[PDB]
């Protein structure tokens, strides 16, 4: 409605009508609400509504109105407080000073307007930002004094204090230059040992829980930056570690607080200091078992109720004693008389390693490698922690989380959808903890896991989770035992899982153990390498799985058969005894049986271990024999397939005949992926009618395409084709980066190729052309670059230029193609740079067009690409020396580089970059001041040094990009800056230092003499 | 039963497009930044009853930040998000939870990792641990896959309700009427139906 | 619940998605399980469709005998096809469905159950 009146200045304020408007936004609900909150943004925004400020907070009745006022007061503060007059500046501080002391001395208010007064608190923090202490050098004093007047006031200066401790230590880095953080920390330092004392009077003297609570969250803070001795040679740990642990109140930030003090890392030779940290652990230690819960407490089922803040404790009892046992225990560990709380220590961690909650198991998890890590070198260690080290070998085992392999999950066991990287890590630490639990103690870990497993025989513990648990834990060690006792160690778990399996018939059952069986075996590779009579029936079960109508049995069996295959292959190339033949024979000539059931991605999976066994023959005449066997079946289906597309060219329609395609020249991927550049005589098999293919495919799609319209691209139908043309193009790509015979692929593979993919590509249309084209181009280059100069060229005549208008428009379209570009664009510039010396004038400028393209991107692919081009193209055209190209490149390009890089430095929307970018400019900069340009660079008085041209333009550049700097801060920016071009580190400080200064007004410009 | 949520984390992190997905089921492509704050009504039915969200999202991009933590008044929850394929939105973490406790300063609040779809992950899981000291509650999630994509939602819904054994429950399904189609404008939907026969489906390369 | 005087015809998994003609484009509307329910009392066979973790319901209506399934330009294993009155979000609004599923075999399937429960409802 008439909700946008305020946002009129003309008339005065009509408080009642904001009031009204602020109750709607958060209040309200719907349409209404919308229109409230656009219209508080833009009365938020208006450069003068600070003025109105005051008036907000001296007449208004709704406290969020206020808030409102407040944050237009810190926006004017933090960005534009020295632009006032001084008057402005003394009446806004006098007014948000006296608003505190108002809140604070009328109780009513103080209790129930907690965030308005924080704000305000905040508020006045920013204010000291700016003025204190150069114009307010008796704030901490009027502070101090003002805090015995009333507890309220008192309580109040704890949270100002906390604000301001957290402005310059916490999160100053960012907000504040150098030199101005340095200024108000020691500020803060100067004047500490007068807060200490209002601190350590207010915890002795002990008002009530309020204060308390508030005086030791700012003690937090300060705990981050104080000198030590505030801590120990006072009594400040006695209270903590007694008093303030025996209320709940005050226990859980008191617990925060020795968190902190325990994470320095304590003057390690006085004996006093030691005594003062072990002693601060025991006084703790003993609060929670007299007032909180006993060692013997069952936290599990504690932190399940939930009930009041328990899980926050527990958490930050987790956080307390991870944090001391892992900077200290060894204080705890020689002392006869500290042992009981050495090991009561730990058992509460063992208690808390028993909560359901991943996060908090996690930080568990972590202090336990800490341990078991110090206690696989550690002399004469591991003895005392003997007991604990056996209870965690129980939590660890049974709570293994279920790892990458195992595909069968219970939702009725059924298959996996998607990859738990979240539970990748987490697995990933359990069995580096039980790994090395192994190694401390080999017996109690086998007697663990097999009595286990002799109780699911029983049936006495079966459940799907007993059986799981135990058997990723038992796969999880292997390589933990001598071959000896593994031997027979995986002897008695096979037996006793093989029995389990018989037993169990379910379907869900079989499932069940089935993957456990498979898990483990899959993980015992130096087992198998050494009973191939075992290996070839684990083989031969594993082809019975890929028939399995359960669909995660047979994915997983597939998984497992090429796992195997990648550790124990030699043992499948050789002739054991009593063998007829190696078993790649066998394998090979029943494949299509073994694989009649498997979906084609599985069929591809197979042929790919396949070829891992292949390559272990070096026998080149066996070797390409065993290829030859390997391709039979895919090598048939292939020269029928072309024998009846050459003749008449339209069978090709057949979505039938284009899936049958793409299979076979997925089989050749797959294949290829494994053997290399041993590939090589099957690929020669097939390349010449594989370009043919590829120019016949392209024909077609083209052909729909202007028959149907762009739309034929989303079609089945067109769809296929392209796969076809992609998997080609992926297979040349697989090869190529893995050929050892380069001169093979120049004189045979390149031209063909090139022959057939580029001119395709140039001349479809956008939508139809396939970036997988740009990928396959860059391994060309990559490989083999140096040696196709000619090639290069045709590359970037058929792809650059029309590649770029596709992707030049915006920063969305066409994102595979702006990756692959970028890719290929690097990797010609690093590899065949002369070929960007050919292109012609009007195309190199759009060369360099292209990279500063690159630079305004916010995907990091890109961006990080561009960045890399442009530097490297600097070293490019540097080390051509004194010569025309070099000399025309700065004339025309060194300005626009510089500026560019500024432009993306500074306008706040590239903030991931900033290290490239810095370090670019730092390069160009350095160009001019090493004189490694021999021509002027510019078009100003003659016989002018670069250097001084280079102030100039800078100088110019940044004075009218950011008019609100002075003169002076622009001077001593690039004063600075230049002299630190050979220093990248201070470099960077300075510009960090100039974005600082950018966002505000009145930045002192002796701020860049920091360094 | 309903209760205020408040949404934060840098620019592009994914808080629009997690809230619409779990508005209306879509997955929203397209990057357009939310100005201010977007406040919509999320409910969920539990086995104790109805749980009803007004989720503020708000803006990540600070030219676009509006009210900023003006926004975070009398929130009873939050959600921090950041994208695990860019370090410096988890960097940025503890800027926004510094500005939310200031004004929130005991309430439940998950971060949450989004993008775990992408490959190229970068902000590793081993490195985040900034949730622990602060009580935080963490997931790895993905908008576009749904990955762990109701889990803030349940664990707040816990936090908030009490009760640890809250769990999400079948909405009951009544009797759908039996209309018959409009001859008057049967002639018509030939057109609003061609057009959506022949506008390709998003993503045919996913398995469903 | 509200689903236990009925029974499960067909139970497919899918993907759901609604026709925005406005924006001209396909909008995810849920993925989980399609179950085809026939009313114990009424012999009338409806659609259901929840949402995979949230359980939600993204489809409820009658298979009407005067549907028909088509294809999309784009897919060979989704339908799309008009309905007149879904009550997954509420009031019974209107809608241009497409369904799609994880193989042409699936939604081949669906088809012949979809035709058969529209003779069924044809009584
Ligand atoms: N691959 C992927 N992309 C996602 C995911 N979630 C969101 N996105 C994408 O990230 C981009 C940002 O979308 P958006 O939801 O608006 O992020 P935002 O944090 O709300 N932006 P702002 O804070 O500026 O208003 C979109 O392109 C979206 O498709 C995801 O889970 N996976
Ligand atoms: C036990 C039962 C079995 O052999 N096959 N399953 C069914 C299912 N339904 C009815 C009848 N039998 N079983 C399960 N798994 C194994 C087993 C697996 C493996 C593996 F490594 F390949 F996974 C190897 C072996 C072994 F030891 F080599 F024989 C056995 N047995
Ligand atoms: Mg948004």
Redesign the pocket.
């Known amino acids: 409605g008439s909700m946008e009146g305020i946002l009129d200045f003309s008339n005065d304020l009509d408080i009642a009508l904001l009031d009204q408007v602020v109750s709607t936004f958060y209040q309200g609900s719907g349409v209404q609400q919308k229109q409230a909150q656009e219209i508080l943004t833009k009365f938020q925004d208006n450069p003068d509504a600070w003025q109105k400020a005051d008036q907000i907070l001296q007449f208004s009745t709704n406290p969020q109105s206020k808030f409102i006022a407040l944050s237009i007061l810190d926006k004017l503060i933090t960005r534009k407080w020295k632009l006032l007059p001084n008057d402005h500046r003394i009446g806004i501080r006098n007014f948000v000073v006296g608003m505190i002391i108002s809140m604070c001395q009328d109780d009513e208010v103080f209790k129930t307007q907690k965030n308005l007064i924080n704000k305000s608190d905040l508020t006045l923090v920013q204010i000291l930002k700016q003025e204190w202490p150069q114009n307010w050098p008796e704030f901490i004093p009027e502070l101090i004094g003002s805090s015995s007047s009333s507890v309220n006031v008192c309580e109040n200066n704890m949270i100002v204090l906390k604000l301001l401790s957290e402005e310059v230590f916490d999160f100053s880095a960012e907000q504040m230059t150098q030199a101005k953080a340095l200024h108000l920390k020691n500020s803060m330092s100067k004047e500490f040992e007068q807060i200490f004392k209002l601190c350590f009077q207010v915890l002795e003297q002990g008002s009530s829980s309020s204060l308390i609570v508030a005086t030791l969250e700012s003690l937090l803070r300060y705990l981050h930056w104080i000198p030590y001795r505030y801590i120990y040679e006072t009594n400040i740990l006695e209270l903590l570690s007694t008093k303030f642990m025996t209320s709940p109140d005050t226990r859980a930030i008191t617990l925060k607080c020795l968190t902190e003090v325990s994470n320095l890392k304590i003057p390690q030779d006085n004996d006093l200091i030691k005594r003062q940290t072990v002693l601060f652990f025991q006084n703790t230690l003993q609060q929670i078992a007299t007032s909180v819960m006993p060692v013997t407490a069952d936290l599990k089922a504690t932190y399940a109720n939930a009930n009041g803040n328990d899980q926050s404790f527990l958490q930050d009892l987790a956080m307390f004693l991870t944090t001391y046992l892992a900077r200290n225990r060894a204080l705890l560990e020689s002392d006869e008389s500290l042992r009981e709380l050495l090991l009561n220590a730990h058992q509460y961690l063992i208690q808390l390693s028993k909560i359901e909650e991943r996060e908090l198991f996690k930080t568990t998890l972590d202090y336990w490698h800490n341990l078991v890590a110090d206690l696989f070198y550690e002399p004469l260690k591991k003895h005392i922690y003997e007991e604990i080290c056996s209870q965690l070998r129980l939590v660890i085992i049974e709570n293994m989380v279920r790892p990458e392999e195992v595909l069968v999950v219970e939702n009725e066991i059924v298959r996996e959808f998607v990859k738990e990287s979240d539970t990748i890590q987490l697995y990933k630490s359990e069995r580096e903890v039980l790994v090395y639990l192994t190694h401390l103690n080999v017996i109690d870990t086998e007697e663990i896991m097999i009595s286990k497993l002799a109780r699911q025989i029983d049936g006495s513990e079966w459940s799907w989770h007993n059986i799981n648990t135990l058997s990723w834990a038992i796969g999880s060690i292997s390589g933990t035992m001598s071959e000896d006792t593994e031997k027979r160690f995986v002897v008695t778990v ?1 037996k006793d899982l ?1 029995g389990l ?2 037993q169990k ?1 379910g ?1 869900d059952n ?1 499932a069940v ?2 993957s456990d ?2 898990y483990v ?2 993980q015992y590779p130096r087992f198998l390498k050494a009973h191939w009579n ?1 290996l070839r ?2 083989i031969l ?2 082809f019975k ?1 890929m028939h399995e109508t359960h669909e995660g049995v047979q994915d997983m ?1 597939c998984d ?1 058969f090429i796992k195997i295959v990648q550790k124990c292959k030699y043992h499948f190339v050789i002739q054991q005894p009593r063998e007829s033949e190696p078993f790649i024979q066998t394998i090979i000539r029943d494949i299509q049986k073994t694989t009649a059931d498997l979906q084609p991605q599985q069929v591809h999976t197979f042929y790919k271990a396949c070829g891992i066994i292949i390559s272990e023959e070096r026998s080149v005449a066996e070797r390409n024999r065993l290829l030859s066997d390997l391709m039979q079946l895919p090598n048939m289906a292939w020269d029928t397939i072309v024998e009846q597309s050459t003749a008449n060219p339209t069978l090709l329609l057949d979505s039938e005949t284009v899936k049958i395609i793409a299979n076979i020249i997925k089989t050749n991927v797959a294949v290829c992926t494994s053997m290399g550049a041993d590939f090589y005589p099957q690929l020669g098999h097939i390349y010449y009618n594989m370009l043919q293919l590829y120019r016949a495919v392209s024909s077609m799609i083209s052909a729909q395409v202007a028959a149907e319209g762009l739309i034929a691209t989303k079609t089945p139908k067109v769809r296929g084709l392209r796969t076809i043309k992609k998997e080609i193009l992926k297979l040349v790509e697989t090869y190529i980066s893995k050929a050892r015979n380069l001169d093979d692929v120049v004189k045979v593979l390149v031209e063909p190729l090139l022959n057939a993919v580029l001119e395709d590509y140039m001349n479809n249309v956008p939508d139809a052309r396939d970036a997988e084209v740009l990928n396959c181009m860059t391994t060309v280059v990559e490989k083999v670059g140096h040696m196709i100069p000619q090639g290069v060229i045709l590359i970037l005549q058929s792809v650059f230029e029309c590649t770029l208008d596709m992707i030049n428009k915006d920063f969305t379209e066409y994102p595979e193609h702006r990756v692959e570009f970028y890719k290929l664009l690097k990797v010609i510039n690093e590899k065949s740079f002369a070929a960007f010396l050919e292109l012609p004038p009007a195309a190199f400028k759009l060369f360099v067009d292209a990279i500063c393209w690159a630079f305004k991107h916010n995907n990091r692919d890109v961006e990080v690409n561009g960045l890399q081009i442009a530097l490297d193209l600097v070293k490019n055209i540097e080390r051509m020396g004194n010569v025309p190209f070099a000399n025309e490149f700065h004339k025309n390009y060194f300005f626009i580089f510089v500026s560019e890089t500024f432009f993306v430095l500074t306008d706040s929307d590239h903030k991931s970059g900033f290290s490239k970018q810095a370090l670019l400019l730092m390069k160009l900069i350095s160009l001019v001041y090493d004189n490694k340009i021999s021509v002027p660079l510019y078009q100003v008085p003659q016989g002018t040094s670069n250097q001084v041209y280079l102030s100039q333009y800078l100088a110019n550049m940044l004075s009218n990009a950011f008019p609100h700097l002075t003169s002076e801060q622009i001077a001593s920016f690039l004063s600075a800056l230049t002299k630190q071009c050979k220093d990248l580190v201070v470099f960077k400080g300075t510009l960090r230092d100039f974005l600082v200064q950018i966002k505000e007004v009145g930045g002192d410009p002796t701020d860049y003499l920091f360094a | 039963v309903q209760f205020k949520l408040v949404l934060v984390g840098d620019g592009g992190t994914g808080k629009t497009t997690f809230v619409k997905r779990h508005l209306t089921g879509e997955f929203e492509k397209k990057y357009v930044a939310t100005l201010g704050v977007e406040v919509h009504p999320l409910v969920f039915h539990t086995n104790r009853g109805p749980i009803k969200f007004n989720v503020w999202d708000t803006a990540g991009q600070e030219k676009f930040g509006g009210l900023r933590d003006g926004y975070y008044i009398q929130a009873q929850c939050a959600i921090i998000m950041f994208d695990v394929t860019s370090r410096v939105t988890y960097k940025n973490v503890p800027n926004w939870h510094r500005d939310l406790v200031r004004v929130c300063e005991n309430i439940p609040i998950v971060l949450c990792g989004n993008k775990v779809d992408i490959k190229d992950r970068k902000v590793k899981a081993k490195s985040i641990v900034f949730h622990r000291k602060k009580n935080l509650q963490y997931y790895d999630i993905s908008a576009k896959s749904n990955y762990n994509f109701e889990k803030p939602f349940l664990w707040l819904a816990r936090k908030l309700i009490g009760d640890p054994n809250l769990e999400f429950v079948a909405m009951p399904a009544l009797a759908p009427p039996e209309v018959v189609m409009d001859p008057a404008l049967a002639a018509q939907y030939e057109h609003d139906l061609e057009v959506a026969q022949t506008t390709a489906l998003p993503d045919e390369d996913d398995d469903l | 619940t509200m689903e236990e005087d009925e029974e499960v015809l067909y139970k497919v998994r899918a993907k759901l998605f609604r026709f925005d003609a406005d924006a001209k484009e396909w909008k995810e509307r849920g993925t989980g399980d399609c179950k085809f329910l026939k009313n114990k009392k009424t012999n009338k066979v409806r659609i259901l469709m929840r949402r995979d973790k949230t359980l939600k319901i993204c489809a409820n209506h009658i298979i009407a005998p005067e549907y028909t399934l088509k294809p999309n330009v784009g897919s060979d294993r989704s339908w799309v096809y008009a309905c007149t009155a879904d009550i997954a979000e509420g009031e019974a609004e209107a809608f241009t469905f497409a369904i799609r599923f994880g193989s042409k075999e699936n939604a081949d399937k669906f088809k012949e159950e979809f035709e058969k429960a529209q003779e069924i409802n044809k009584k």
């Open positions: 096979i093989l399996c018989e018939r379907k079989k153990v089935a069986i498979m075996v899959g075992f029936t684990v079960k594993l799985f069996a497992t």
